[model samples]
Target: MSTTDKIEQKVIEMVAEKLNKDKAIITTDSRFIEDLKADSLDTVELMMAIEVEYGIDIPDDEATKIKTVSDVIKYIKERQS
Candidate 1:
């Protein structure tokens, strides 16, 4: 996988692990709310985890835009790239 893909996959794995979700359920197409069963609190915690894991700050506005695994990946890639 390319660096971006690798990073994206890692983000998905982190999310799955923290949420106690099956890794298989975390895909680019998977919706954080509907498919991953993440509520508002879960979203906040997930963002915090991502920030800690990546050593990046995900602003509240940007976090709200994240809907799928791909969205988080894109956000991170944009900020980190």
Candidate 2:
């Protein structure tokens, strides 16, 4: 598979595991706060997890722009490239 696809899969898995939700329920359009019901703490932890997993530093400004699951995937893909 392509690198983007791989990153997307890993992100979905991470979000599911961290949120304690089933993998099948998460979609690209899922919103972190509205759809996943993530509180402020959950959002912070999730961003940390993403940073560590991908070996990238996510600035607070950039993190705020990531509202959906696809946003995270897109950010990683762009950074990786």
Candidate 3:
């Protein structure tokens, strides 16, 4: 698979785990709050996991931009590249 695909898959797993949801139901277009029912604290913890997993820091401003599952994957992919 491509690098972005791999990243996206891993991110999907992480998000599913954090939200206590099935990976099968979590799509790239799914919105964290609206689709996955993530609250503010859940969002923070999820972002923290992503930061540690990718070894990259996500500022608050950029974090605000991450609304969908695809957004997180794309952010990590762009930062890694």
Candidate 4:
């Protein structure tokens, strides 16, 4: 399914580009620091990317709590309203 409707699509695309991989390979089940091979710093970079893309602030404590793609998408959606 093409991802023009949900945050997941954007997240998948963003993470894929950041990791130099295809978006099709990204999944909500994929963890940033574990499955994706991103170090803590990498997640910080990606977290900041999400913040910039949507113009929001992800606290450092909250940042570390976001492990998987779903966590990010959930956090973002929660921040929306």
Candidate 5:
């Protein structure tokens, strides 16, 4: 898998584990709201989970743009470098 794909998969796994959902249900095309069945609070929790899992902070400003699994991985890739 490509770097982006790997990152996306990791994020998906993290979210699925945290939410107690199947990894197959979380995809790059899945949106936090419509696809993942995540609410506003769930979104916040996901961000926190990402930060803890990745050991990197998602600034409050930047976190708002992350709506999909791909977005989360892309953001991490950009900042992680």
Candidate 6:
């Protein structure tokens, strides 16, 4: 797999773990609140978990708008470098 694919997969793993959902159900377009039934607290903790795992932080404005799985991965990719 390419680098982005690996990043995508790892983020998906984190997503599934945080939401107590199966990896099979999560997709790039899956929104945490909509598809995963996550609440505000859940979303905030999820982002914190991701930040800890990835060793990066998402700014408040950018972080708040991260609704979908794809957005999470994209932020990591953009901010990682």
Candidate 4 lDDT tens digits, 1-81: 734357766777766755555766676666535666777766667667767767777797787444467776777667765
lDDT of each: 0.68, 0.68, 0.68, 0.65, 0.66, 0.69
For model 1, how many clashes?
A: 0
Name the top lDDT candidate: 6
- Compare the candidates by TM-score and give the number of the best one: 6
In candidate 5, which residue ranges exceed 4 Å CA deviation? 1-5, 35-37
Error of 6 at 14 (Å): 1.9
Sort by TM-score, best first. Answer: 6, 2, 1, 3, 5, 4
User: 68, model 5: CA deviation in Å?
Assistant: 1.5
After superposing candidate 2 on the true structure, give the runs of residues whose Cα lies further than 4 Å from its correct spot.
none
Q: List the residue pairs that clash in candidate 5.
A: none
lDDT of model 5 at position 13: 75
Q: Would you estimate the TM-scores of all the predictions?
A: 0.69, 0.69, 0.68, 0.64, 0.64, 0.71
Native-to-model Cα distance after best TM-score fit, residue 31 in candidate 5, in Å: 2.2
Q: Which ten residues in a row have the lowest lDDT in candidate 6?
A: 63-72
**Model 6: per-residue Cα lDDT over 1-81, one tens digit each:** 458678766776777766666877777766656755777776778667767777877767886544467777776677777
RMSD of 4: 4.0
lDDT of 2 by residue, 1-81 (tens): 465787666777866754565777777666646766778876678667767767777788887544457777777667774
lDDT of 5: 0.66
